[PDB]
Amino acid sequence: PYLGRIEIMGASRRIERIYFEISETNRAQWEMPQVKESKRQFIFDVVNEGGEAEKMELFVSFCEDTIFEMQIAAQISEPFWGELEVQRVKFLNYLSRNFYTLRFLALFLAFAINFILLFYKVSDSPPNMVYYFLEESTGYMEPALWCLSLLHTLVAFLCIIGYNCLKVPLVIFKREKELARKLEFDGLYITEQPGDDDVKGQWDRLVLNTPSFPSNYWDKFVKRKVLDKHGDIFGRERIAELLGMDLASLEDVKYQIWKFGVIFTDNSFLYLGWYMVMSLLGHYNNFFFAAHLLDIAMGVKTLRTILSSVTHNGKQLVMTVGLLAVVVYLYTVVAFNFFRKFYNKSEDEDEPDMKCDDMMTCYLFHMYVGVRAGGGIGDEIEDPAGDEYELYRVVFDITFFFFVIVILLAIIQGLIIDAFGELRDQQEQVKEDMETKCFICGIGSDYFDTTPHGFETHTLEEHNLANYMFFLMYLINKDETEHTGQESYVWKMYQERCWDFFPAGDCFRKQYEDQLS
Amino acid sequence: DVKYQIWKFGVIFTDNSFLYLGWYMVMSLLGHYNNFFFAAHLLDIAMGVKTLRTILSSVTHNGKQLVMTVGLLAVVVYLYTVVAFNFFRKFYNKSEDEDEPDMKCDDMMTCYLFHMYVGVRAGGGIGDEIEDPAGDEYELYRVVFDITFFFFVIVILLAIIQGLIIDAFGELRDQQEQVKEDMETKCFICGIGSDYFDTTPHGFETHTLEEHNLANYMFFLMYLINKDETEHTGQESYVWKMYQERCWDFFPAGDCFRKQYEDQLS
Ligand SMILES: [Zn+2]
Ligand SMILES: [Zn+2]
């Protein structure tokens, strides 16, 4: 239960098995459903849109993110300026622990507000100017709407605060983590400099000189390592002034501005801010509470997966909608040049309403009524029977119907129908790969299945990606002086970002098969 | 045993097929009250005909997602209703009479019902039903309203609804094909690939007919159950003990007689 077990490619160039102790708190945090869903999403992403070369780097990044999330969860968990500080941190922890409940409550409140909004009525007379007011016999909905609007605004504000307390630390952690990696192993601001059209790199400069650069990232030796790696070649004084460190120490408005910039560029934070703004506009005009019904797309995973079918081929949907416009424009040109006499949409004899005596009017008429008509433009425009251009006109109508109504809408619907099957195939392929190959070492399940339940044992004990994350957390928490020999070996390999200690293509059984059996 | 009979009757009354047959009998009884209650027994074809059951399985495979997209259509039509009720109230007069107007969007509930009723069922959307906007101040906003309604609701949402069914057909077909491929390329009892047995001609056929026959395993289990404990032989007693302790380790997994004695046999 607490006894951990991983296999590494040891210094002796052989597979070695490492035993360590796992904390019950870490095990419970791992078993939490949020972490389970995060792991599933990561596995899907790497199997689907990932390369075999970078699989271990991606896996280590996932492990680091999961470790930081567990640390934040442990921080927010629960068992005269001091009094207000204690109360404030308690309130913030409560908001962080109930962020998702607050989001669900906000969705419910929006639904209730809109259901009450379904009873609004418009009258010229008071209960030019028109008076909008509720019309219900019960009388409870009129105060209920005001109470629910106040509650919805409060819940939206609490959701913003909870997000800032919970999911912003991870964004800042990843940002600082990536900046440190690029600074050390790429010399981004020492050797190359950013692209300059890269908004992120330019903003990141503001934080290099700050004393609190590794505020969330664990490694506090980021600057010292970069100095040792680069200063000897590129100027010790220049590196020190760039990184804002003092060279005689061997015996933050800018940081806050940079942090706020990252927060304001965060997509989920922007979405929650827009949600709060619309909730505020709701008190101005209650029908602005109808823009919070769009939150179901982010709320319900089933609806999100359904809409993913539409958005999988969204670029091609836009392309085919823009192609429909060009085809209808060509039909408009032909109509305006040759069949102007059929586009009289006025029943009155004396005054004619000619829809194709102007190019813009004809194009609007086509794109409006011809596309939405069941049989095309022939349904709307005048019948050509007994006319000189009857055959040209019937060819016009038939080709419009076939190319636009039939073929183009068939393409639009086939894109969605194909997107459904493509997403299904992606899920099936990920499942098949995860059930027929080992993630860490990439050895087929047939080899392990010679022993009954061999692949199950290999994926549960020998090569467990949960155990690897537990070992990484163990190394990070353990002291450098306290590290044992193999732990120091793996720690050095991790510090140099060398993923060669992961057994790739080899395992304990494959190495000692002759002796074991 | 009154308690045992009560428990048995509770299980019977919770049985789904028993409840279905009880409902069938109740509707048959109501038929004598009103003969048109015999039309509720035409729904029995779904349970009766396996072909129709498999056809309806296409609809029911993604039934949760069908309900979800029907509930999403309601929200989208509600947003269009809000926009209409706020801005285009003047186009929703469905009365040919000049003096008395029938305004379908002077009330939020009436407008929502009008949209969900006629706009969804119309071929071109709500623009077909409501008044033409030509020569009006809000003509462009109104044509954008109509075009987006047609594309999002009539085209995209119904395309999603039909794509769910079309995908369900292919998914069921793929399930059947995968089961057939697994059953024809791997052995059920021991999980050894057919390629190994196919070195001998008809080797996999012989393995699945004589060596590892899941019919033979059921026959042996019935034989053990019927046979007396005292009459059991040695290996039969071994398997009987393993069965009593619910230990399925006597099933050969990954090994077979041929694989074990290949050197001696050939
Ligand atoms: Zn492995
Ligand atoms: Zn077998």
mmCIF file of N, CA and C in Angstrom, chain A residues 320 323-325 327-328 402-413:
data_model
loop_
_atom_site.group_PDB
_atom_site.id
_atom_site.type_symbol
_atom_site.label_atom_id
_atom_site.label_comp_id
_atom_site.label_asym_id
_atom_site.label_seq_id
_atom_site.Cartn_x
_atom_site.Cartn_y
_atom_site.Cartn_z
ATOM 1 N N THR A 320 -16.798 26.111 -46.411
ATOM 2 C CA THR A 320 -17.894 25.744 -47.301
ATOM 3 C C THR A 320 -19.027 26.762 -47.251
ATOM 4 N N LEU A 323 -17.808 29.312 -49.595
ATOM 5 C CA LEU A 323 -17.968 28.821 -50.960
ATOM 6 C C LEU A 323 -19.409 28.918 -51.444
ATOM 7 N N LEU A 324 -20.367 28.668 -50.552
ATOM 8 C CA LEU A 324 -21.770 28.882 -50.887
ATOM 9 C C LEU A 324 -22.013 30.322 -51.313
ATOM 10 N N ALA A 325 -21.352 31.272 -50.649
ATOM 11 C CA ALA A 325 -21.505 32.679 -51.002
ATOM 12 C C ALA A 325 -21.006 32.957 -52.413
ATOM 13 N N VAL A 327 -20.745 30.749 -54.936
ATOM 14 C CA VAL A 327 -21.621 30.102 -55.911
ATOM 15 C C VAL A 327 -22.911 30.897 -56.086
ATOM 16 N N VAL A 328 -23.492 31.362 -54.978
ATOM 17 C CA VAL A 328 -24.689 32.185 -55.068
ATOM 18 C C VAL A 328 -24.385 33.510 -55.752
ATOM 19 N N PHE A 402 -29.522 21.684 -57.282
ATOM 20 C CA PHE A 402 -28.611 20.563 -57.077
ATOM 21 C C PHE A 402 -27.308 21.006 -56.425
ATOM 22 N N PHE A 403 -26.720 22.107 -56.893
ATOM 23 C CA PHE A 403 -25.420 22.512 -56.371
ATOM 24 C C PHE A 403 -25.533 23.110 -54.976
ATOM 25 N N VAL A 404 -26.548 23.936 -54.733
ATOM 26 C CA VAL A 404 -26.623 24.655 -53.467
ATOM 27 C C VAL A 404 -27.442 23.873 -52.450
ATOM 28 N N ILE A 405 -28.699 23.583 -52.783
ATOM 29 C CA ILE A 405 -29.591 22.953 -51.817
ATOM 30 C C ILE A 405 -29.130 21.538 -51.490
ATOM 31 N N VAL A 406 -28.724 20.776 -52.500
ATOM 32 C CA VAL A 406 -28.415 19.364 -52.305
ATOM 33 C C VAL A 406 -26.945 19.174 -51.951
ATOM 34 N N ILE A 407 -26.048 19.546 -52.865
ATOM 35 C CA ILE A 407 -24.642 19.179 -52.717
ATOM 36 C C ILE A 407 -23.981 19.964 -51.588
ATOM 37 N N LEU A 408 -24.214 21.275 -51.521
ATOM 38 C CA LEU A 408 -23.497 22.076 -50.531
ATOM 39 C C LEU A 408 -23.986 21.792 -49.115
ATOM 40 N N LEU A 409 -25.299 21.675 -48.925
ATOM 41 C CA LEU A 409 -25.798 21.302 -47.608
ATOM 42 C C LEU A 409 -25.430 19.865 -47.261
ATOM 43 N N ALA A 410 -25.327 18.992 -48.265
ATOM 44 C CA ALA A 410 -24.844 17.640 -48.016
ATOM 45 C C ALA A 410 -23.401 17.652 -47.537
ATOM 46 N N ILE A 411 -22.572 18.532 -48.101
ATOM 47 C CA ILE A 411 -21.193 18.674 -47.634
ATOM 48 C C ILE A 411 -21.164 19.187 -46.201
ATOM 49 N N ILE A 412 -21.980 20.202 -45.907
ATOM 50 C CA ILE A 412 -22.036 20.744 -44.553
ATOM 51 C C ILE A 412 -22.430 19.683 -43.536
ATOM 52 N N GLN A 413 -23.420 18.852 -43.844
ATOM 53 C CA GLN A 413 -23.829 17.787 -42.935
ATOM 54 C C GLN A 413 -22.858 16.615 -42.896
#
